[PDB]
């Protein structure tokens, strides 16, 4: 019954979330550069797009038309430039901040009217342990800044749209085994020091993160809004 | 299949959580001073006890024997002495800190071995918006201290028991309509200023809080531990 749009939905965390939503009976549309194969496999509508360049408003419009409505928005698209601040160019800084933060704002702003019309909505932004820390041995200042900024956006939008029936939250996955994080998992100087700080002693599978994402996209979150929910195996608590 | 013990389970938030767990197929035991009627109504095992005086270890033992095991512990017992610090006696301070914090530690410490034996466990402590603030117009310094202390205990136990298959989290309900909070709801000078800060514009029903509690007591929290999850209608984000 609920209609959902998941960006970065062809692989990694986004894919896992899309699968979880389909399992809940939601009509799902996934956006990424080449979502065709994943969409057919998951049972979702494919929406090819380059979110680093294409107008976000346009993607929301395409989702509304493809689904016949829009109640849920999950922005799980991922990109990164893992370079220290003094090496990072402004173009690279902007690339990371645009996709993670500006697009988050633009997508949510475009989706809200439709959720309000339905009187029910769920916006789920994707954070990180870097929403609360700086990534430790990994040089990701731009990513850290963007993922922390999302907590402010989450609070701001949650505050303004609560009366409209929309809940806005920030799911903060910990260290997860995906293609996106391979550079970290393959480097011992990164993987070892990080994993030693995870009480559960292992990285997460995307599906384990998606279990919580589904909750934040359902009736379970009726009175839950403007919050970050960290699913990190105990990393931050360590 | 899962066996759960819920303190403060005859009314308010505890009762709602017990109901939610029974709905999930869990075998539940509720503890409070007079749980008989509620237990019969909910379909749970009654465990009469005065947690402000009776040895917590004894209650856990009684739960294990009544349920045939123990996988879940929810400490939702509630008490308060709403007096400013300069008026509060040490006895009153200790009354609040003992029931909310010391008993939390003692119950969890006693339950952990059984959860570890089963290789799966969920400990859910109950926080408050006072885990992050001081209660605003309400004079509750002891309660604030205890509910904030629980976040430290949550992190500490989560860190040590993660490898044992136990997840430990702090559910922080916002302003909820229960008998316990009537003094706040009945006073305009308290209710009005507080509610004006809740984006959703209303207090929660216990059942709405329980929806999230159930998640934190299930497989959805497999990779979620050592965290606080606030379900407050947007109050803290405001």
If DSSP codes are grouped into helix, strand and coil, which group holds residue B150?
Answer: helix
DSSP-derived letter for residue B19 is H
Experimental method: X-ray
Residues 132-191 of B with CB under 8 A from A: 154-155, 158-160, 162-163, 174
Dihedral sign of CA atoms B163, B165, B167, B168 in order: negative
Number of domains in chain A: 1
Angstrom distance (rounded) from CA B133 to CA A96: 33
Furthest C-alpha separation in chain A:
50
The order of strands in the sheet holding A3-7 is A45-48, A27-32, A3-7, A72-75, A121-126, A166-173, A228-231
> DSSP characters for B87-139?
T--HHHHHHHHIIIIIHHHHHHHHHHHHHHHHT-EEEEEE--GGGTS--TTS-
> Looking at the complex, does the CB of residue A232 fall below 8 Å from at least one CB of chain B?
yes
Residues 36-95 of B with CB under 8 A from A: none
Angstrom distance (rounded) from CA B98 to CA A79: 48
**Domain carrying residue A12:** 1-238
CA B216 to chain centre: 12
Those residues whose C-beta lies under 8 Å from the C-beta of residue B135, and which sit 6 or more positions away, are B129, B143, B144
For tokens 């996709």, what's the residue?
Answer: A99
If DSSP codes are grouped into helix, strand and coil, which group holds residue B229?
Answer: strand
Give the active site residue among A26, A90, A143, A238: A143
Name which of A158, A217, A218 is nearest A9 in CA terms: A217
Cβ count within 10 A of residue B93: 17
Annotated binding site of A: 8, 10-11, 13, 50-52, 78, 143, 147, 176, 178
**Structure token pair of residue B223:** 């990779």
CATH number assigned to the domain comprising residue B178: 3.40.50.720
Angstrom distance (rounded) from CA A159 to CA B128: 19
Angstrom distance (rounded) from CA B81 to CA B139: 9
Q: Which residues of B touch A236 (CB under 8 A)?
A: 226-227
If DSSP codes are grouped into helix, strand and coil, which group holds residue A121?
Answer: strand
Resolution in A: 1.5
Beta bridge partners of B4: B28, B72
Chosen from A16, A172, A234 to mutate, greatest number of chain B CBs within 10 A: A234
């Amino acid at each position: 019954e609920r209609k959902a749009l998941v960006t970065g939905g062809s692989r990694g965390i986004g894919r896992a979330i899309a699968e979880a939503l389909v399992a809940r009976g939601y009509r799902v549309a996934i956006a990424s550069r080449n979502p065709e194969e994943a969409a057919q496999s998951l049972g979702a509508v494919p929406l090819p797009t380059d979110l680093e360049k294409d107008d976000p408003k346009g993607l929301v419009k395409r989702a509304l038309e493809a689904l016949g409505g829009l109640h849920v928005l999950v922005h799980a698209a991922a990109v990164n430039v893992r370079k220290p601040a003094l090496e990072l160019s402004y173009e690279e800084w902007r690339r990371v901040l645009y996709l993670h933060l500006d697009v988050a704002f633009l997508l949510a702003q475009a989706a809200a009217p439709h959720m309000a019309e339905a009187g029910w909505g769920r916006v789920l932004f994707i954070g990180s342990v870097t929403t609360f820390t700086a990534g430790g041995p990994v040089p990701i200042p731009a990513y850290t800044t963007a993922k922390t900024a999302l907590l402010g956006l989450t609070r701001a939008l949650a505050k303004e749209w609560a009366r409209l029936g929309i809940r806005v939250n920030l799911l903060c996955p910990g260290y997860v085994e995906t293609e996106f994080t391979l550079p970290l998992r393959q480097n011992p100087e990164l993987y070892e020091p990080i994993t030693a700080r995870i009480p559960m002693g292992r990285w997460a599978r995307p599906e384990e993160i998606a279990r919580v994402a589904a909750v934040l996209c359902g009736d379970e979150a009726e009175y839950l809004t403007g919050q970050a929910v960290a699913v990190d195996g105990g990393f931050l608590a360590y």
